[PDB]
Amino acid sequence: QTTKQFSKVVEDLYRYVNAATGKPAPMISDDVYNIVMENKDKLNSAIVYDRDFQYSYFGFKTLERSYLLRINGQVAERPQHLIMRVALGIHGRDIEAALETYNLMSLKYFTHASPTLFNAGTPKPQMSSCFLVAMKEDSIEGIYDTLKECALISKTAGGIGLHIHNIRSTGSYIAGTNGTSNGLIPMIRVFNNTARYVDQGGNKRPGAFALYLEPWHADIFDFIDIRKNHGKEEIRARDLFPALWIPDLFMKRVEENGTWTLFSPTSAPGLSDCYGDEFEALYTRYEKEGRGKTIKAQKLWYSILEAQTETGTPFVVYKDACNRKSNQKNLGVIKSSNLCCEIVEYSAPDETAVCNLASVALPAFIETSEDGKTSTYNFKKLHEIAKVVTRNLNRVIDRNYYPVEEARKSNMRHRPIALGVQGLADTFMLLRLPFDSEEARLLNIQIFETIYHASMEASCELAQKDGPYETFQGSPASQGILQFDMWDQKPYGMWDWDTLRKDIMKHGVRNSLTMAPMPTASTSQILGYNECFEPVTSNMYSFQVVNPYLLRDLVDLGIWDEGMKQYLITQNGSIQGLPNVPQELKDLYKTVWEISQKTIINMAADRSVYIDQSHSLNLFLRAPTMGKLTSMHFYGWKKGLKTGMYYLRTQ
Amino acid sequence: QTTKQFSKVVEDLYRYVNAATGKPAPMISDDVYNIVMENKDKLNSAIVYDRDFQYSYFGFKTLERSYLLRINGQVAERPQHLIMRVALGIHGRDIEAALETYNLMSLKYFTHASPTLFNAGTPKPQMSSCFLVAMKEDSIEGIYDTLKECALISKTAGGIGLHIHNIRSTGSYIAGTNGTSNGLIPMIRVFNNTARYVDQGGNKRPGAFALYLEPWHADIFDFIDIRKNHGKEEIRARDLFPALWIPDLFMKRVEENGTWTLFSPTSAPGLSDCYGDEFEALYTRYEKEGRGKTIKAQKLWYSILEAQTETGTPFVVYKDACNRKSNQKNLGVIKSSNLCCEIVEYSAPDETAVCNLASVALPAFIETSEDGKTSTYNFKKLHEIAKVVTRNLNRVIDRNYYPVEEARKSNMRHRPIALGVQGLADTFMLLRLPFDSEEARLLNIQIFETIYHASMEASCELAQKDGPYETFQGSPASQGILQFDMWDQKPYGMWDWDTLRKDIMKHGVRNSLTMAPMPTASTSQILGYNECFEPVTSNMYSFQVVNPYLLRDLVDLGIWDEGMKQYLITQNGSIQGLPNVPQELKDLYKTVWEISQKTIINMAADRSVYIDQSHSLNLFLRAPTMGKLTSMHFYGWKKGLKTGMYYLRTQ
């Protein structure tokens, strides 16, 4: 049901007019149109339309649902067109680069995040997925500029992490009136309302700011309860996500079972603009000085746990871990993560942090390339692809249209990048590895060591052509301190780290950061693999498709009948305690609610030393309990995780 | 319960420190403090504390409730202190002017509007009562700047009229996405929320923006229903007031029983930036061109009437009447009135109109100064006072602190002023005049002719000292066209208009506008007179005090017993059809729901020719009906009123 020739599809898209208004509304950029026109034979005959049959039913309908460009409501783009469009939007005149990217993407080696897919090659090429915004000032002027900026950003694809540690709390003094501040909640209500008013493009995905607060803020109790479904209404903000920016001290006081003290940022200035010991000194001293309100640490902590149990939020991100181990630490103190708890980047009133995202398809590097029929992992092809994806993301920074001036300032200075992964559960299943196997633990480490090593290497080459990023001098990277070093650990050593460190000190890197494995919520669905790096949630997922790797095996052992199909609906994806299934299969197809949360934390802990930034660590508790969750928070904290917890998923 | 000496009270107020914070929080300005200090004997011995006993019980507790400055929650200011503070805040070093104002105010000749009383002589002297704001642009950037500006203004005393005729309506096209606009309502929800978040000072008076829209706007149906108490929720905005900016054509089409056509301002640009014939031409032409959605005029009109019947809003202000008859017409087309439908001033993205307000106490100019015992009205003393009040308001413009740059731009250019009145019902009762008497009709005209004539004269003297306002050249006033001229009417001629016109053409005036009789909601209560220019709402008002002029008479005819007191509770203030009361008394103490709305419109109509601006014409219907209200709208329209209707008060 679609024009076949690609330049012919680019012609329609570009010449498009809105009949209802007589307005010429071209959907390809001038730039990209011209490239397509000046290289139409090369480009048209490079496309292979067979690759459209690489997409599952439920994967393609995601592409058609909201990805492939429409003309007057009918789908205009074939999946191959969307890719070729993307490849050109990223690469411009670099037809060779463009052609390479096309192939790897078409063949499902990797893909870019949804904004890139939406907007690459179009006149408003907003290709970035996340924005980290600083509250400009503790003033009415400051609040409404920030409000204005969130709106302007929300106008285009991508979510906002916004931190608000500097907004004075309920009842704080205001010079100029006998009026008293109402604190965070009423203000949060303003933001919530703005998030409901500005569509993201023109859309079906409602609100989406995540709000970052440090637990010493005086308004914290209400703040954490923002997503509750009863209390009052005007005390809630149901389209935002509260996230805790937790300092170590808070966890120490919980552990010690001691006191915790709540300040308005105005009775206690500077808490968020320092960390580690210095923070502890400054905090202890204010606390001695009578400046705040002391209560029992565990009273807060018990409340945070209710919130998580009921709403799966607030998220938990360790402030010190993030700041101690960032290559951006030379820039100043990092005040928040992003919407999905994976970006860890510096922000200020005048610099709003951005990231571009792509994910590598881990299954595509499996081969039974030995001889007989035993699979291996081509860590070489993986390193190769990761180098390509690095190059792409870096170009995107320059061909990107920024929604606001503070985002362009930020990115052009530090050029952070974000690579991640999907299909890790698939990769384990295909290689016949239980998620909790010593093998899967080894494969995790290995995969992540290779993506990091490649991305850093490819970035080093880039710095060689185009100079290091503006703020590379004085960074930990400039001092030969890469991520794992900052975790006081030797790398696993599958790649030659000395040589790389050697070159990086000599030449710089192009990006301040490179890795931030993300949720892959929709892009995993497109390529038909399991989200990012989490185990399967069920084997049935749900219009009810059975795990292909399971199903395959179930027929090979010929134990698949109606008794099997119904048991899967019945036990919703669990194959454990089921009469006629080999232990091998059971260990292999454990659902996520059947893997120890301790193993999850560990494999997170392990891969974490090859992660510039952080990752979207969801926790899954089957039969949740105050103490059971308590130990999971503290275990991760102690591992030195940055994102201790994204969502608490329950039931 | 208060320090007696005034400089001693100014000392405390000025030296004040917030114990809870250690912050020095002075409540007198440096300026004013110094003046008080350098003239302490003159100032201390000028005060007469007997005049504190000029205030009714219920009047004083208004002063104490929220007017007299507090120190740590205890009242610090005596009523005389508040006045002397005001007089100084307005006059600075002009101790002579200051001393005069003190006397007239203390003696209850006139008073300034609540912001002036709150803030005069204090460090943040925001003395203005109303702000007329232009929506900056049909963009996200424009919406949120305007939002920001409303917030900044709401921070200090004074209400906002904001017009939004240029915001594209539901379903309008947006370049850059396949998204479609959601129009006014969601946007209105943003404003509503901001109005709930920013206290006015630090306060008990909740929201308060009035929104001005022209009835051809495509989103009008919902817009008018903003204050309803059922429908949905997210379709309402319950802390704002919808006001209609109605062009004559709309009323013509209703009358004719014809068609009416709704445009998005983007399918039909320029409708709000013209008026009279030119508008009609432009509107007729768009309407021929298919650009909008036609429906039956009376379908809208019937809806507007439901809204008014249920919610008393939307207000009605005639766009053409306002624009045809403004001395500001040289500035460009006027797009809105203010919160209380009395200011009619020009505004633009870069110029937000302001007004300063004072009201004259009409009863204070009654004397039985003849000989025997027959009262007259001292139109001479009234003209004298009105000259003083003009001078005051004009100083306020210069000693005022502006909440935003667009307000200071506006006022320094055009210097509009707003005088009004209170106790007109009292004046009628004291002079033994039924509100509908040929005498009261004559007195109305006379009073208003004298305030206007004085204010214009006093302004002319001012222009002589300090130059005309910047934009006087090309104004109707510069061409010898004063208000009544623009109504094609000879003045009543109690004052010598030729000489004045003569001087004005020669020398200019200091103010673009001078008269805008306002609601006097709280200041009438302070001086203990009936609101502005409306008849009494009852004779009992309500903790249940009886009309003093009635009560007086009831004892003189000795017909006052318990039978009387209860009948008044029973019939809630009506003395009509009551067995033992003289016709004279009945005609005199008609409640407002007993005066023909036709007489009200007329006396409005009459005084309207001496009103630069407009006035807050509330309508009162006892047994309301579609057609009964219909005739009241059209009657006023035809009279050429500007504010056809403020609130529709019912029951």
Ligand SMILES: Nc1ncnc2c1ncn2[C@@H]1O[C@H](COP(=O)(O)OP(=O)(O)NP(=O)(O)O)[C@@H](O)[C@H]1O
């Ligand atoms: N009218 C108001 N309503 C609600 N909150 C307010 C108001 N005025 C100030 N605030 C809050 O007070 C804080 C400071 O606002 P800002 O406008 O800077 O105050 P300011 O008048 O400049 N005085 P200050 O900042 O206290 O020296 C912000 O957190 C505001 O949210």
Ligand SMILES: Nc1ncnc2c1ncn2[C@@H]1O[C@H](COP(=O)(O)OP(=O)(O)NP(=O)(O)O)[C@@H](O)[C@H]1O
């Ligand atoms: N993401 C969005 N959500 C809701 N309303 C929007 C959005 N983008 C634009 N609008 C509305 O569209 C109108 C124009 O906004 P603006 O930001 O100027 O659009 P633009 O992207 O500049 N394109 P255009 O103005 O149509 O040429 C305003 O009335 C906005 O309220």
Ligand SMILES: Nc1ccn([C@@H]2O[C@H](COP(=O)(O)OP(=O)(O)O)[C@@H](O)[C@H]2O)c(=O)n1
């Ligand atoms: N529903 C979503 C998902 C992601 N995002 C943003 O995109 C980033 C991660 O997206 P994701 O992992 O779901 O990837 P895609 O949906 O781009 O495939 C987050 O940092 C968010 O800022 C969003 O705004 N809304």
Ligand SMILES: Nc1ccn([C@@H]2O[C@H](COP(=O)(O)OP(=O)(O)O)[C@@H](O)[C@H]2O)c(=O)n1
């Ligand atoms: N409750 C009120 C009353 C008036 N006002 C503003 O003050 C002007 C008229 O006030 P008013 O007639 O009630 O007079 P005062 O309350 O100043 O005595 C209006 O134009 C409004 O802008 C307000 O903001 N809130």
Ligand SMILES: [Mg+2]
């Ligand atoms: Mg401030």
Ligand SMILES: [Mg+2]
């Ligand atoms: Mg625009």
